[PDB]
């Protein structure tokens, strides 16, 4: 009864830690773009978030599928074997809710850079 309750709270903590990990991956693509005064695609032309290598697992590792990261990603509405940054951010269920009406890209501009505004929008969910 008590040791079972402990293990549910570890599973909740594992899932949150995974969600934060995905936001970290997204946020580091966004900073890579900002650094190279570059744009970022977040649709199917952008990165695939269902990729073992992003979270420490090698490509064919069978325990990838048992990971709390894959658990989160593969349970979303938007999952289809692959998962774009927009699919993840707009997908449910996850504890940061949803982001609707994001464009498929945020291109580098010289004034009010849309990459910068996206960085801020994404950063206000890791909070």
């Amino acid at each position, epitope marked *: 009864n008590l040791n079972a309750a402990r293990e549910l709270f570890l599973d909740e903590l594992k899932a949150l830690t995974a969600e934060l990990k995905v936001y970290s991956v997204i946020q580091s693509q966004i900073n890579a773009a900002l650094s*190279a005064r570059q744009g970022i695609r977040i649709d199917a032309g952008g990165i695939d978030l269902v990729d073992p290598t992003l979270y420490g697992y090698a490509v064919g590792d069978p325990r990838w599928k048992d990971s709390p990261e894959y658990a989160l990603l593969s349970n979303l509405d938007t999952f289809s074997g692959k998962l774009s940054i927009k699919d993840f951010l707009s997908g449910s269920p996850k504890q940061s809710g949803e982001l609707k009406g994001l464009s*498929d890209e945020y291109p*580098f501009e010289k*004034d009010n850079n849309p990459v910068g505004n996206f960085a801020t929008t994404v950063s206000d969910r890791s909070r």
Partner: antibody
Amino acid sequence: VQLVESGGGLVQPGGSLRLSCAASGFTFSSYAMDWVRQAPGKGLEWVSAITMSGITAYYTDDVKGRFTISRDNSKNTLYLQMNSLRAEDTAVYYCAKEEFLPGTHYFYGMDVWGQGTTVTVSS
Amino acid sequence: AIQMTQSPSSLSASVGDRVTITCRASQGIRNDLGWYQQKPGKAPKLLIYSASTLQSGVPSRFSGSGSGTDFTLTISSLQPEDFATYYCLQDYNYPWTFGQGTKVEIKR
């Protein structure tokens, strides 16, 4: 490197034209693209730009809600759909490739231009 | 918004002279300003970008200068090939906007 425009001609006020620009001898999908126009005797007017992906478009004020820029990267082709045309749209329309600073999407100008295609709007 | 005002609208000079065209922005545009050359019935050609960087192939007599709102194209020793119209372009804000042009005519 080469850009060849086509699709210009004669049209009446309120009518429609589709301009095409055929790119060759460079990786079309890696560069942003523009339309620039020049009315007879007047100077250059930037009309529209589009990102390498073809997803985000930008427009000059005279043209907003009338023209639509687009591209097909599998065809190496840039388009300009021109609706609600009027006499003042009469001009040579140039297709132009944008260039970025090395390793960036930091746009600095148009280093390759087409020869232009003429559009004439009149009753 | 951003309006570019070149001057003079036109200008006369001889082979060998030192020519100077000015372009003024209605607002700050950093160094995000290019210069283009056009000749009659021909496509424009980029000469200078980022206010002062020479496009490769453009000869050294051309040179660019300025920051913020006031900029300057300069041909140190004008040549027969340089008689043409010159336009400035800001790309700091969308819509990008050209100057109204500056014709360089042969003097006599």
